[PDB]
Amino acid sequence: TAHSFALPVIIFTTFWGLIGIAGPWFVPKGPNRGVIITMLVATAVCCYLFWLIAILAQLNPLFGPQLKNETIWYVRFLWE
């Protein structure tokens, strides 16, 4: 179970960048164009920041999880 920090970062960065950058140019024109664009950009920024904080916090762990002996025994068999 090798989770490379290239596919996730690229995929999520490009997805949220599209949502927050291209979407304002695609929103239809009307009274709510401005508010909808604000929601698109703010959702992009907030969700991307949260996900980035999580992924970085997990990256480079200074200590491993502490698992009871029963669950370590079970996980050895089940998980990779």
Binding site: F77, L78, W79, E80
Partner: protein, 214 residues
């Protein structure tokens, strides 16, 4: 009953797509493999002359395990296979099952409600959408299943298993194989997946012509 619909070239394509991916489900989801090894340590009394292991279709190989000899004090060390390819095997199996169900539904509709299916070309448009989705799914799944089969042949390979086993690193210990898994089923499943992808690609043009977009 519009058996003429089935007999028509589009109906023949639907019947072929029903038979295919069902052959694939039978080949893959019923696959069951076995491997046999033997280890003669420095002391013959501690030799593991016969060790047999069995695995199923899902290829959750990292779960498969066996107590290989340690060659020291006659003890045993638990050894697991390396890596799993369920993400590809189960994905292809589910794609094939969905394709078979869709083919059965399409055949039933053509035999019974072909007029409703052809009405307003809305049914042809839905068929074209499903055909594009299935073509993309098959294109991904064929490569995924081929890679999974190759990597599974590598991982389940007794040569690789022995090479990774620390018994060979000892003095006098000799590890050999006895049998290998039957790759015929996996190869046939890969061939059937490629054939299903080709059938979906061909049916894309037929669906486009039926919908009038041609």
């Amino acid at each position: 009953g519009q058996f003429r619909v089935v007999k028509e070239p589009l109906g023949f394509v639907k019947v072929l797509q029903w038979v295919f991916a069902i052959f694939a489900f039978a080949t893959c989801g019923s696959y069951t493999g076995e491997l046999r090894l033997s280890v003669e340590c420095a002391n013959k009394t501690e030799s593991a002359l016969n060790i047999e292991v069995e695995f199923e279709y899902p290829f959750r190989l990292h779960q498969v395990y066996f107590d290989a000899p340690s060659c020291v004090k006659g003890g045993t060390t638990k050894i697991f296979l390396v890596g799993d390819y369920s993400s590809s095997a189960e994905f292809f199996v589910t794609v094939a099952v969905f394709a078979f169900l869709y083919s059965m539904g399409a055949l039933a509709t053509y035999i019974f409600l072909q007029n409703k299916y052809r009405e307003n070309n809305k049914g042809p448009m839905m068929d074209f959408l499903a055909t594009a989705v299935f073509a993309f799914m098959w294109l991904v799944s064929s490569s995924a299943w081929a890679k999974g089969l190759s990597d599974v042949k590598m991982a389940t390979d007794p040569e690789n298993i022995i090479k990774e086993m620390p018994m060979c690193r000892q003095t006098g210990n000799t590890c050999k194989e006895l049998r290998d898994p039957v790759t015929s089923g996996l190869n046939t499943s890969v061939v059937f997946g490629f054939l299903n992808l080709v059938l979906w690609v061909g049916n894309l043009w037929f669906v486009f012509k039926e919908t009038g977009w041609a």
